[PDB]
Amino acid sequence: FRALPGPSQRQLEVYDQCLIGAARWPDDSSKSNTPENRAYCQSMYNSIRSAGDEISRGGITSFEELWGRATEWRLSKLQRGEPLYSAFASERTSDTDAVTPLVKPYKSVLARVVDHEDAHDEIMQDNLFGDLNVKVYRQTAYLHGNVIPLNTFRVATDTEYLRDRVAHLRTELGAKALKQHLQRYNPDRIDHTNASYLPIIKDHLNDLYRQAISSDLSQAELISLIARTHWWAASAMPDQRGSAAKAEFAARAIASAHGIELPPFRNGNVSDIEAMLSGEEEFVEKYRSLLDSDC
C-alpha cells in the first residue's frame, strides 16, 4: 500500500462544511439552516477528514472498518439515553424485512416514483385496502453475472379511495391495529434490500474500497469508484438506522484520502434516495451533477 495525499489543505468554506451530510429535501430545506443541523454537518465534515487521514496512511484496511468509523461517528451525535441507539449501532439481520413509509419527510419521493421513466404499473393486493393500482420502481443490481433486487418503491394512485377506505378501517380495528398495518404496509412505501444479500454486498464493498485506495487511479476513475461505493452502500442500506449518513461519510472519507474535497450535495438532492432511485451506472454518470460544484 502506497501512502495517499490525505485531506486537502484547501478546505470547503464553513457554509459548505455545514451542509455535509444534510438531507436537503426539495420541499423542506429549513432543517439544513438550523444551528443543530449545521453543527451536525460540520462535525461530519471534520470526522470524515480525520478518517481520510487514516485511510491515507494505511490505518483503515477494509470497507467494514471504514463503516465502523462512520457508525462510531453517527452514534456519538445521538443524545445520551437515545432509545434508537441499538438500531443505529446494528446491522440488519437476515430474519428481518425493512420498510420506510413514504410520509414526511419523504413526500418529495412520491412524485419521483410516479414520474420515473422506469416505473411500472402494478396491482398491489393488500389484505385491508384490497387491490390498489401502484406505480412501482424496482431497483436492481447486477453482480457477478446475477441480478440482485434492491429497493422497491410503491406509490398508490387511487387517493380518493384510500382516504375513504382508511377512515373506514380505523374504527373497526382501532387506531392500534391500523397503525400496525401502516408501519409495514403503508400504501406508499419503500421495501428495502433483503438483508440476506448483505454478505455478498459487503464483500463487494470491500473489493471496491481496496480498488479505491490505490495510488494509480485518475481523478475521473476515482470519482466513479467513489460514486459506485456510495451507490452500493446506500442502496444496500446495511444497518437498521443511519445507513444513508454512514454511506455518505464513507464515500467522502475515501475522496478525502486522495485530497479531494467534495462539496455538499445540491439543494433538493438527498443522496441515498437518488441512489435508491437509480441503477448503478446511471448513478455513477450523474454523481458529479448531484454535487454542488458551482462557484
Binding site: 438500531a87 430474519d95 420506510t100 413509509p101 387517493t159 384510500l162 382516504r163 380505523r170
Partner: peptide, 25 residues
C-alpha cells in the same frame, strides 16, 4: 382527488417517517 400521499390526513394511525424493521413472515 387528493395528491399522492395526501389520503392520510388527520389519521391517528399514520405511520412514522423512518425505517422500521420487522420479522420476516
Amino acid at each position: 382527488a387528493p395528491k399522492f400521499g395526501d389520503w392520510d390526513e388527520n389519521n391517528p394511525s399514520s405511520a412514522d417517517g423512518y425505517t422500521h424493521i420487522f420479522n420476516k413472515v
